[PDB]
Design a protein around this ligand. Structure first.
Ligand SMILES: Nc1ncnc2c1ncn2[C@@H]1O[C@H](COP(=O)(O)OP(=O)(O)O)[C@@H](O)[C@H]1O
Ligand SMILES: C/C(=C\P(=O)(O)O)C(=O)O
Ligand SMILES: C/C(=C\P(=O)(O)O)C(=O)O
Ligand SMILES: [K+]
Ligand SMILES: [K+]
Ligand SMILES: [K+]
Ligand SMILES: [Mn+2]
Ligand SMILES: [Mn+2]
Ligand SMILES: [Mn+2]
Ligand SMILES: [Mn+2]
Ligand SMILES: [Mn+2]
Lengths: 519, 506, 522
């Protein structure tokens, strides 16, 4: 039996491709889909983070809708301490990116019983009072719930629904007062701290960038984060404001715009143009729009990102049941697989790693599913259709990238080795979707961390001095990639790899492609 | 904004089709994917069943893994009572099918105990421990177990929630709260239990007496297992559809011979994802649905599709995408198990499957699907496939609001459904069982004709076509002056729908 | 019998265009029916009644009367002979073939004057010499190697310095070096002997000659009196030219088909508006290859045929298809290839000019077109072609298209031997032909002109019904279907127990064939 679904790869039609998928065709060792993990109470110790990294985490997401600056600064330091504990073996060291996820124009509840991790059970049919009175900001419980949108009474009426925590709990407004709402719990569930609140259709008036957003973005720059996940982006102008806040000092921080309401979907094209990448933020998106339409938004957005070559993240509830169970549901296995098949560069865990009982198992499960689904992609058709979509561009690096991926298909190469400093050369390869892993070797450590945003880029940090002869410096870096792929089991001596390098030090892209045997 | 994802429908590539998907393009009213609901404590009252029918339930599944014949007979009676309460109005009456899901060669065990990781547990076949099960000695009813498990292999208990490794003397690899009569899987074991036990024969014969429409047969491993079920159902049960459940490695490996012998297939993902690595289930699901689509045989996607709605009135984001992707994959029907059998929100679960299916149905890439289906069957020159293809082709070209099919065996309508129009297929039949079994097929909206046969063939055809016209208007599938494709027999003995017309709605 | 190779059906099953080509099989036998219409220019070699009887038996569907030469009396007699020869077969309604009459107009022309006053004198033009073109009528009988008069008074408004002027069917070519108000100083690029009263071509110019000459206006009215079926309209450059021809034909000629001849750069550039206004197109490769560089003609041919195929409007490939058969009983290998590639390109009809008007082998030329066309028709890649035609027309939701697409699709799936189409205007059968079944389309009609005009469409085999209308509609439909059944059996298109697709109207008033049946041949 051909490994890597290579019998399905040769199919002529999509139907035949599907009919050839074979549970006994082994996937390869390399896993191309980036894994992004929300770090919080369950996952922020140095010891757990070491195991997260070993289980496959590539990006640590800090959610600034929770915690304080000091809380997230300590989480981040632990991420970097854990990451650097593997630096004593540069062949095995994995770069780990740090992402800051913004509050944005959102509504949040307060602290249950003065704690960011406390919860209470709401009973169906019980009464629950919402108050605006800051005396209760840190004193929420099963009777009294505070939230931070001072104008809420002007946008809801008796009979309105108030949804808490991505639609988990629905509250029906029964009475209104000057700074309170008396509601009835329409369905039971557990209410925790600082939960999002959605009032779908209602005219919530909040700025693209709040004063708290400005302080969090500035903290991101101070902390040297690699990327910002900008919540509730609704138009290109919002991205521009975020980029302005990040300023000259933060000019290389990637802005990933989160699509999570109707307007972000309807203005998607201008948002993508202005952003460095996209998150399909299904948590909010699936209570802001009809839940049966989210999959339409997801495949549209992933496809248009693939077309532009810009990273796209699929997020939220992918393995939700694993918050409490050590194995996922069948719908959850299917969801991760299909997001990889849709074309997502990265997949993400939220509660599964931030607060659940099985954070390592959730990471490990995303790793296993992603590898299976990567082999089950229909690469030959995908490449043809991406090439068609980009054909107005005659860009030279795109040409090198398409030529290299094409060669990698024909000779079934075990990897593409790319030498890159800004990352661009490796990004353009990733965009044309080889099945083999892309080992990107860079002396730019931030380039290495940000590469996790792209399907199939396995970044490697070169810490050696720059050799006097350009040809020897190229070889030193190619040989580093060679030793990494051997150590990771991506290939062995005598396999064939594609190697992308710059011809001269002054080439500003990898204009040189070789097929070489592994030494 | 064109409705029904029609902009995406005209794309040239799959990538472009996805990039054109539009949350503001409204789906049509008709919903083509059959909805199968397991009936249990939460849903077996006559009053709840009526709402299940209103909410979109097409097939009532009785799970014989549990409950007595008396229990299930009463469930079936209530299903029929709720169904017939709508028979007053023949224009609005929905036929509802009854399916019997066999127990099969299950392995079960004999309050609560706790098994903890690393603890050593002994698996006894000594019947004295049949009811003396604790965290040290566990009794299971598979008495050939020790001949089929090697040392070191894994033993899975309780829906896969616990794991053990044979050192039977075993070590708990990951433990939990252990109960009575819990499911047990031996993946990578060549389980020799018979596909049909004496209990299964009792249940199958009971299904024949209860006039069920279809059997979902558990743990089918080979064509011979299907043949044995067919044998048991016998001559009296000969028109009962056999749906083979694929739920272990051998069933996947031998899938082609199983499909050949079966009337249809269930992807039984619950057990399947215990028997094989859970990360491989989607490969099996897509392979099986695709191969059923090629053959034109019904395929059901099953298990945990909306699992969280057992306790919550709205589903997770993964559950939404799972239902949608099963429809895009090609499943004829989707199923609910605990969500309707015992959960807190059975009506909402049914309604959510209805809502997601309609959206996903519009998002199918019909032009390419048709081409590829036509390609895969091109060695066949069958006349009714030719009528079906020409009719679906015509329905794409003029954006017909429906295909009306007069059928008595259902065969003409099944061949239309196999080529996957986007418009609903209103199948008018006088054969009540044909009407109920048609729910197994994507897009067939069965309509039972109770009128006597007219002396004049032309007039009897007109009577049945006008009944479909009235149904479709009442249900909002079309209105006067829309266009429909109508498929009939030219003469009483024609043998299939050899006549196709484009007809305006009156 | 799955091992018997017929109709290139193994190549039909290929997945790619390359694999389809790799599967073409000289030992895969074609069917009897030949779908590409054959248009023959009638002339001194083919004009007699007895020769025309043999032309019809060899495969002629359309007789082309070329009004560039001959008087009205001459053409009346040719037309008369065509109808005598056609009707001599009318005693067997099962075998009778309708035969259309086409009028091909002379059209507007540009001509030079007399060399030294003499119809027979010539001068040598030398490459690099200077030659002045003048409009001064003083020189119209005094042309020579220094002064050439021509009769197109607006020539200086439509050409410029650097423009080419071609003389005598492209024999001589001239480059404008200087332009005055009523003269052109040219240099000879390609020399030759220049005679009297020769044709002139202006490559790339927007020639503003009228759409029809005064001779054309009289010829067109004559054609209405002669009851011609179609007009091949010369030198069509824009939609306005088509409308003018339509105006002249007027109310009495409103059912005559107008086929626009594309002959020069402007007509290719404005093709889309010409197509919309026309009933069909002729790729007039002779004059087109004078007007545009000959190595570009195949581009225009494949473009025009493709765009006609997309619209469902008839297209003719014309000129020098079997040229060497003017003098030889067998064609060259390039000629066999040319005919076959025109059919693969999508042409509804192919045409003979000199080969039938004046050559030594008119019957052999007709027979060879029939043979090649049958072979190339099976070698089409119908599955891909139908998919691409359906894609191109998908903005139309037209009901008759839907029936035609469904009917052709069914005919592919069950390898039907024919489609039977009952039609009065032709429209229902035209829509079926548009979607390119491999099986012949037997179109039964009571309208004799519909039957003759149907030859413009690939695959339509028209059949005239002469039986009185039956009072019961079902009986009248059955009568016509059974006639198609007897025609197809007599011609060997099918035999008892083969399957055919049958397109009829459900009721007398249905307006198109809204009813499709798969039917066994009785
Ligand atoms: N930094 C944190 N501190 C405490 N709890 C957190 C933190 N990050 C996440 N969580 C918990 O995990 C849940 C899911 O994580 P996430 O999806 O990032 O949050 P949300 O959906 O609330 O924006 C949160 O609602 C919160 O209960
Ligand atoms: C549906 C199914 C069979 P059962 O629920 O009877 O174990 C499964 O395993 O998915
Ligand atoms: C037929 C034709 C045009 P004309 O009839 O003007 O010679 C041609 O040149 O191909
Ligand atoms: K956030
Ligand atoms: K069962
Ligand atoms: K002429
Ligand atoms: Mn979240
Ligand atoms: Mn959000
Ligand atoms: Mn099962
Ligand atoms: Mn010519
Ligand atoms: Mn001409």
């Amino acid at each position: 039996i051909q490994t890597q679904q290579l019998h399905a790869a040769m199919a002529d039609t999509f139907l035949e491709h599907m009919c050839r998928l074979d549970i006994d065709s082994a996937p390869i060792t390399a896993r191309n889909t980036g894994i992004i993990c929300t770090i919080g109470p369950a996952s922020r110790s140095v010891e757990t983070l070491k195991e997260m990294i070993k289980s496959g985490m590539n990006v640590a997401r800090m959610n600034f809708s929770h915690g304080t600056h000091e809380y997230h600064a300590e989480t981040i330091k632990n991420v970097r301490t854990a990451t650097e504990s593997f630096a004593s073996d540069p062949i095995l060291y994995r770069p780990v990116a740090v992402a800051l996820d913004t509050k944005g124009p959102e509504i949040r509840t307060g602290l249950i019983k003065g704690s960011g991790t406390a919860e209470v059970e709401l009973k169906k049919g019980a009464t629950l009072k919402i108050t605006l009175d800051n005396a209760y900001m840190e004193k929420c419980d099963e009777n009294i719930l505070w939230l931070d949108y001072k104008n809420i009474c002007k946008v809801v009426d008796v009979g309105s629904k108030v949804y808490v925590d991505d639609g988990l709990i629905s509250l029906q407004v029964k009475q209104k007062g000057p700074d309170f709402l008396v509601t009835e719990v329409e369905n039971g569930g557990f209410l925790g701290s600082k939960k999002g609140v959605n009032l779908p259709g209602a005219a919530v008036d909040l700025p693209a960038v709040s004063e708290k957003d400005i302080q969090d973005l500035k903290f991101g720059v101070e902390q040297d984060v690699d990327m910002v996940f900008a919540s509730f982006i609704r138009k290109a102008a919002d991205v521009h404001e975020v980029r302005k806040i990040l300023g000259e000092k933060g000019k290389n921080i990637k802005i990933i715009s989160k699509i999570e309401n109707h307007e972000g979907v309807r203005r998607f094209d201008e948002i993508l143009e202005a952003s460095d990448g996209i998150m399909v933020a299904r948590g909010d998106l699936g209570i802001e729009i009809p839940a049966e339409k989210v999959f339409l938004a997801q495949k549209m957005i992933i496809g248009r990102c693939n077309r532009a070559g810009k990273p796209v993240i699929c997020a939220t509830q992918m393995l939700e049941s694993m918050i409490k169970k050590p194995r996922p549901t069948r719908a959850e296995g299917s969801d991760v697989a299909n997001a990889v098949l849709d074309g997502a560069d990265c997949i993400m865990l939220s509660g599964e790693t931030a607060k659940g009982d099985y954070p390592l198992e959730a990471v490990r499960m995303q790793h296993l599913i992603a590898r299976e689904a990567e082999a089950a992609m229909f690469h030959r058709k995908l490449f043809e259709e991406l090439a068609r979509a980009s054909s107005h561009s005659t860009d030279l690096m795109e040409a090198m990238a398409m030529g290299s991926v094409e060669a990698s298909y024909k000779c079934l190469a075990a990897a593409l080795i790319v030498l890159t400093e800004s990352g661009r050369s490796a990004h353009q390869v990733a965009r044309y979707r080889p099945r083999a892993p892309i080992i990107a070797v860079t002396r730019n450590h931030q380039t290495a961390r940000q590469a996790h945003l792209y399907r199939g880029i396995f970044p490697v940090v070169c810490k050696d001095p720059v050799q006097e002869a350009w040809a020897e410096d190229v070889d030193l870096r190619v040989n580093l990639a060679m030793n990494v792929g051997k150590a990771r089991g991506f290939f062995k001596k005598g396999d064939v790899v594609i190697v992308l390098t710059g011809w001269r030090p002054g080439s500003g892209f990898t204009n040189t492609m070789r097929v070489v045997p592994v030494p």
